[PDB]
Design a protein around this ligand. Sequence first.
Ligand SMILES: *[C@@H]1O[C@H](CO[C@H]2O[C@@H](C)[C@@H](O)[C@@H](O)[C@@H]2O)[C@@H](O[C@@H]2O[C@H](CO)[C@@H](O)[C@H](O)[C@H]2NC(C)=O)[C@H](O)[C@H]1NC(C)=O
Ligand SMILES: *[C@@H]1O[C@H](CO[C@H]2O[C@@H](C)[C@@H](O)[C@@H](O)[C@@H]2O)[C@@H](O[C@@H]2O[C@H](CO)[C@@H](O)[C@H](O)[C@H]2NC(C)=O)[C@H](O)[C@H]1NC(C)=O
Ligand SMILES: *[C@@H]1O[C@H](CO[C@H]2O[C@@H](C)[C@@H](O)[C@@H](O)[C@@H]2O)[C@@H](O)[C@H](O)[C@H]1NC(C)=O
Ligand code: NAG
Ligand code: NAG
Ligand code: NAG
Ligand code: CL
Ligand code: CL
Ligand code: NA
Length: 527
Amino acid sequence: DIIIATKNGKVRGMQLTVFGGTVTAFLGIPYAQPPLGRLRFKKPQSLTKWSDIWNATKYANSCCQNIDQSFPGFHGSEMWNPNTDLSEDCLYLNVWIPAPKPKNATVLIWIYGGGFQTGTSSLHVYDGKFLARVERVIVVSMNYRVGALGFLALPGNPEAPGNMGLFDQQLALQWVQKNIAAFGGNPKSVTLFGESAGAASVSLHLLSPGSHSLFTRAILQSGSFNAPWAVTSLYEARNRTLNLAKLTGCSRENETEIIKCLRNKDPQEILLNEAFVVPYGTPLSVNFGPTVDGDFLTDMPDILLELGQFKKTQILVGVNKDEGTAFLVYGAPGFSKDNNSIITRKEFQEGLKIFFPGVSEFGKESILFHYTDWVDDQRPENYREALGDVVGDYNFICPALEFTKKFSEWGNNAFFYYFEHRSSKLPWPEWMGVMHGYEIEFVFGLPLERRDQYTKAEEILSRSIVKRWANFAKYGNPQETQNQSTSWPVFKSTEQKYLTLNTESTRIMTKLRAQQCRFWTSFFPKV
Ligand SMILES: *[C@@H]1O[C@H](CO[C@H]2O[C@@H](C)[C@@H](O)[C@@H](O)[C@@H]2O)[C@@H](O[C@@H]2O[C@H](CO)[C@@H](O)[C@H](O)[C@H]2NC(C)=O)[C@H](O)[C@H]1NC(C)=O
Ligand SMILES: *[C@@H]1O[C@H](CO[C@H]2O[C@@H](C)[C@@H](O)[C@@H](O)[C@@H]2O)[C@@H](O[C@@H]2O[C@H](CO)[C@@H](O)[C@H](O)[C@H]2NC(C)=O)[C@H](O)[C@H]1NC(C)=O
Ligand SMILES: *[C@@H]1O[C@H](CO[C@H]2O[C@@H](C)[C@@H](O)[C@@H](O)[C@@H]2O)[C@@H](O)[C@H](O)[C@H]1NC(C)=O
Ligand SMILES: *[C@@H]1O[C@H](CO)[C@@H](O)[C@H](O)[C@H]1NC(C)=O
Ligand SMILES: *[C@@H]1O[C@H](CO)[C@@H](O)[C@H](O)[C@H]1NC(C)=O
Ligand SMILES: *[C@@H]1O[C@H](CO)[C@@H](O)[C@H](O)[C@H]1NC(C)=O
Ligand SMILES: [Cl-]
Ligand SMILES: [Cl-]
Ligand code: NA
């Protein structure tokens, strides 16, 4: 029986057997007042405090969110859907600690992705019990508000200031600072890690003055705030907020009246209108996201990054070989998870209209010119392959490389990886390759469970990743020092060395996607 005394009360956890050892789990500890009623759309309020023992013995509710219904019955998509009841009462976190209680362990805090519109900490691929068991770190993860309920913005108005879901994250980080020594953790050794929107979040915590002293280091998996989907301008934000008002019959003249109205709508009415606050969207739409609010974010973040105004510390950044393939079966003509999706020059053109709503015609011709100089066979899968690369390079890979260059130009060590292993258990078709999201299970150590039908080469790959991530968090250096592994060099502007992660041998390469990113990074933002 394990009871830990926290500043807000006592909590009881539960013991789990993992690989012939024990980890203790505290699932669903609250970290804020439930944001209901008049608290809807507001910054999270700190926690009142209970007496008696809070039982943290199951995962809490997930925050309200629309769900992916494109492939009912399909594990590939359904594995990302929420697996606890949805509810506005969702502000909870989880802690996993090694047994016996460690003495001053390093802390890993996970922030989930989901486009800022979806996600939850209780997914199976985010289970922190392997990391605690194997590397004797503490793992924490939190639920934060997503969609309008987490990011609705009427700039300058504390009834709806914007960025509320980012303040949920921040307050969870504060909870770790005040409470983690009680569970055996070292608050002076805290690493944030995250994927996609969760990576983008990690990168804004690097820019946010209020987050500066709540963590030590940061890991960014497939995402950063300079991605084109990650930050909403103040103009779009207001247009979207009134557009949602209009659609829910909440249009008013006094802005506090709109918010007051919207606080009487009920969750399903808000969720149901989120998709249309925008004339045209794409499979990568972030209708309600981070904004420059003058509080969490004090200036456009491209300016902060260029001019060196962020937390000085080490970073670990990466991307997957086929980032862009997942999104093509959500609306590109000729694509299906149920066939090899050979498409034609003209389907490719239509595909760009889907992914670049506009985007002048010259904008779109220039993408085509740059990605369709075949060399050459012909090669029926030429156009199918080119559309995934377009989507991956633009949305994930070039933005992560550019964040990494600029961050490192200010004097800090940075490490970059390119993950190129396709899970032997991937339920999506072969043509989709090393998809977005499918490194996560390796980072969390799921392939360490033999019972689970991964190959031997995959167990070893996972074991090596887990060690590198842990060494990064503990010591600031992602090396695996014992099994004569390849050294991971720091990434600098100039040489730009990166490390490949795959089940054969890993290599040091230079200048990932050099020609492609010159296009996205120098030219395209002009059109
Ligand atoms: C700001 O919003 C307007 C409003 O248009 C929207 O009305 C909302 C309530 C919502 O239902 C949404 O689906 C609808 O489009 C946008 O204006 C629209 O823009 C398109 C393309 O230019 C026009 O064809 C429409 O006529 C026009 N609608 C109206 C009613 O004027 C506008 O684009 C948007 N501006 C942005 C992007 O900030
Ligand atoms: C690969 O499949 C796509 C997807 O559309 C189809 O999915 C199949 C598995 C099957 O159930 C089919 O009936 C379903 O519509 C095909 O794209 C479609 O191609 C058909 C040609 O009949 C068009 O009529 C559809 O408009 C088009 N749909 C979309 C949304 O793209 C595609 O042709 C097929 N390609 C192959 C076999 O290479
Ligand atoms: C636990 O260690 C504390 C300091 O260790 C951290 O100090 C940071 C500045 C940074 O170097 C981290 O990477 C270090 O790991 C120490 O001050 C505490 O007193 C220790 N607490 C214990 C053991 O009770
Ligand atoms: C907390 O959990 C334990 C389960 O054994 C129980 O004994 C205790 O009464 C619980 N309190 C509740 C259910 O609120
Ligand atoms: C709008 O209504 C709010 C809410 O009662 C009120 O406090 C505010 O003064 C009004 N704003 C103006 C200046 O019209
Ligand atoms: C090192 O290699 C051995 C096999 O010789 C393996 O079992 C062990 O887990 C490896 N350690 C890491 C951190 O990869
Ligand atoms: Cl043509
Ligand atoms: Cl190696
Ligand atoms: Na050009």
